[PDB]
């Protein structure tokens, strides 16, 4: 329910752990997940595009489902990712998810490849939204997805009463405009790291991040300066966290964020094809920009799930 | 192989028809795909985009290679598409496919949403054209998957023994430097109906088509007037063509050519959500523009769940 | 100097008033820069952009920067537009309005038209600081001229001690690094109205603004908001003020900003070809959305030839 | 005329020569001039872009002007780059050239810097078009100017009687239908020399070039390999001709083309500021590319014109 998300700010968009071998690490996740309650992690996203998403199998999502609510016990709210391009798959995910349990919302993408207008976008969603006692939040990236839904788009779906936000990366006057527009019980989030100071002064809820795996606290810092009124100490912050954004998206992401998760002892591992790990050389550069660690170095292969 | 689609000019990426319930319209497949062997297409992409692939199962998929190889019966090459964004699944398909046989080529898209690294992208193109026999054609399209494969990705994979074209969707710049640059039975196609006279020009070996469902016979008069040095013509034919390609692609594809399609006769049906047919003020002006017809909100259906 | 400019939140860059024979109206000049510092305008950029400055002679400018040193009689700094995209040009005008005196700046802006390499960026700049007493503000807006001074580039030359600050039109990346590594005596304004709520939230020391010409008030509201960390006042000012911003620049300024002045009363006149007047059905959208007002082809002039 | 223009294919946009002073070299002119009209220069463009109009003077482009018809003494028609942003500096300027004579058009960019709608763009050339006894050719670059005209106000000008042709640099497509649509008496031009193989294959009367100054043969080569009807030829040539159209704007032109004419003897100096000329590790692979010299090579300095 839009309740139990409305208080959230540091919403995490979780990894996969994978071994050298492409299974998926489940032992892992216990520490990862303690690390990001730990470091101001108020909700949780699961399968999204951090995760890997497109190279998770359907019974692969139900596994993280479960050893994610497990280890979370109930203690901060988690969404699940449910669309893909295809309304129908969305349809019976999303309904099986909602049986499922667990969850206070389903994410679903902007259709990519297929590239729909608004029109199917809109029936798009509609449909989603109908089909399950789960309520959806919208994740608008042309930037991943090439199309966008307008705000007109965005506004017409977000009166539908299963839909009850968005996690908007397009422009901060689109942002705005959602805030200055939105219907009630309709949360507006950020999905991007760089802009989250910006979306937060604008009257957005919050950030559905990457940044938060390894920089929680200071942005916890940036956004209590935020609600604390002490300007000059948000953007303090914020200048030195754009370049920190930067270097965990200077290489296909979650490559950068995992380099960095396994340098700091998670074991992340690698990353499943088509994505392949961050190159050595951008490797060190990354610990250091990003956590101020020095790597100690010594071509680099994706991995595949097991074919057995 | 290569030496199936050495000669191909036209190479249609086939519609799949959808009833108004939205399961597979089979019955429309052959007198639609004998007006496309009617009308020059030589060579035949399955479940490619204009397929709406991202909205057919794996085994309607199958089942449409079915239908089409009995109606097709040998008289052109055929081209399945095989890739996806998730690097395991296309192997596993690539292989599906190569078993079930009949295809000469398998074409994988450059990964959408996921925005592999170049290295990315060679690590998985190399695993599905290590997978099986069937042979590699990679799809190059970042105004669908906003990344692309550089040219000279692109030819560390042409390398591959088993990788024999790309369908090129990039710039002209582009396909002039693979043209150059390409190694033996390596085939370049454009995917760009618009472009298709540019890329003939260049050197292609030829086009991967949406508008040959509607247009074949201004297209083959066009490289036929390129092929035979006839420039004025061929340009004269290019240059009101245009229009009707920009017409095709004015909603989004296949929304306009099943529109066409339907007012041809053919029972196209409408598109799988989240793709809804084309508006009705719309399909007025895509006919009229597009094959000079007289024609006359909007529902895009999904699978039946039952 | 740096001095007289440190404390400007709101630097107007003041319109030109013209006559419907394209003429200057040199009589529009006392009320409208009154009407200025009745709405919290802290400083004045003359000849800038909005002021048509492609359109107004060598000596037009010179009796621009007289009436207006008149009527403010000191009680604001004023800075010329000095820089064009000939580099000598630049340099001989600098030291003319250096001689003119009353300035406390001159605003160059990254060269137009010839796409000049960051080095050449760099010889040009320096070249302008080195010519003269007057110091420098760069004008870097990517929007209007294609190329752009990277940071990196910009950080070299705010180590000129005769340049000062820098007028940023290039996203609120580029603002925030900016802000961050800036050396001592320099001064960062953005120059976009929609992002200078933000751009004043991540630490800039004001606005170049158009809008402050209708718009002034709300401009002073939010910026007061903002440094007496009242933010949901200053974002509800924000979000409700980027419309208005949006209609500002709707048809190409300074149109709209013009259109909105003649309605208040200030005979802002027509603007001078290649540029010409918003039309009818969009000065009514125009009025109605920046300044509540209830108005209601378009002919551009030309400078007399005589 | 357009008649004068009518037969014209390679129009070369002649640089203008500068000593290591920043004054013009007109010395260096007549061999310059020669060598083009000797490699397939149909119709020289004087004090456009290439020329590096914005950092002429008025009486230096009158100079240039008298300079240049002196020494070609009527054997190629000439076209004067008469537009800047301003519409009365234009209305003048075009009127003195007309004055002038010995052009057989002038050639007016569409207006850079100022932004203006297509109803500003339209009454700006209508202005200039009418002004004068010379007729107009629009030099239509959002690549150098941000705006541009669509095809729909270019063809509203192209029925004025005095507007005669255009420099199209926009897309293939926007040229295809410049040629169908296109009045009687006008003239289309790509300003791309990496597209005018396509331009002349879709129908376009020529070239306004930068690469005819040190490729014009190859350049030939191809275009009648187009009108013989030899496309393999044609196209073999254009597949090699695009990294040198490439390397001749790999720095900001015309530093690469001046490079090159430097190499060749040419003298044609440096660049005025705000234009520097190439890094030397630029110009021996700029040269090796484009001419398949080796420049032995031995920080770079852009030239002001005398202050005196
Ligand atoms: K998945
Ligand atoms: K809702
Ligand atoms: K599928
Ligand atoms: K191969
Ligand atoms: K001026
Ligand atoms: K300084
Ligand atoms: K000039
Ligand atoms: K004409």
């Known amino acids: 329910s839009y309740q139990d998300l409305k208080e959230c700010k540091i919403i995490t968009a979780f990894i996969t752990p994978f071994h050298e071998d492409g299974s998926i690490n489940f032992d892992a996740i216990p520490a990862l997940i303690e690390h990001l309650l730990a470091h101001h992690t108020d909700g949780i996203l699961l399968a999204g595009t951090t995760a890997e998403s497109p190279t998770l199998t359907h019974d692969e999502e139900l ?10 016990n109930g203690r901060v709210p988690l969404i699940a990712g449910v669309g893909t391009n295809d309304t129908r798959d969305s349809i019976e995910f999303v309904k099986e998810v909602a049986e499922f349990g667990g969850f206070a919302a ?5 259709p990519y490849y297929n590239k729909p207008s608004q029109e199917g976008m809109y029936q798009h ?9 789960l309520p959806i939040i919208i994740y608008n990236i042309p930037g991943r997805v090439v199309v966008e839904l307008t705000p007109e ?17 397009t422009s901060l006057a689109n942002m ?4 200055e527009h939105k219907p009630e019980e309709f949360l507006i989030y950020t999905g991007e790291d760089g802009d989250a100071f910006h979306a937060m002064n604008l009257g957005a809820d919050g950030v559905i991040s990457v940044a938060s795996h390894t920089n929680g606290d200071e942005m916890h810092e940036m956004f209590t300066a935020i609600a604390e009124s002490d300007m000059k100490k948000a953007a303090a912050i914020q200048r030195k966290f754009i370049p920190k954004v930067n270097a965990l998206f200077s290489y296909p992401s979650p490559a950068p964020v995992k380099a960095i998760l396994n340098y700091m002892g998670f074991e992340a591992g690698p990353t499943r094809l088509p994505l392949v790990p961050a190159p050595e050389e951008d490797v060190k550069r990354i610990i250091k920009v990003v956590v101020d660690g020095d790597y100690e170095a010594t071509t680099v292969t994706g991995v595949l799930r097991p074919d057995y």
Chains 1, 4 share one sequence.
Not at 63 to 72: H, I, R
């Open 63 to 72: 596994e993280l489902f479960a050893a994610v609510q497990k280890v979370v």
């Open 106 to 110: 389903g994410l679903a993408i902007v």
């Open 125 to 133: 969603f509609k449909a989603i939204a109908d089909a399950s006692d």
């Open 153 to 169: 788009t965005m506004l017409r779906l977000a009166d539908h009463p299963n839909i009850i936000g968005v996690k908007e990366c």
């Open 176 to 179: 705005a405009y959602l805030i």
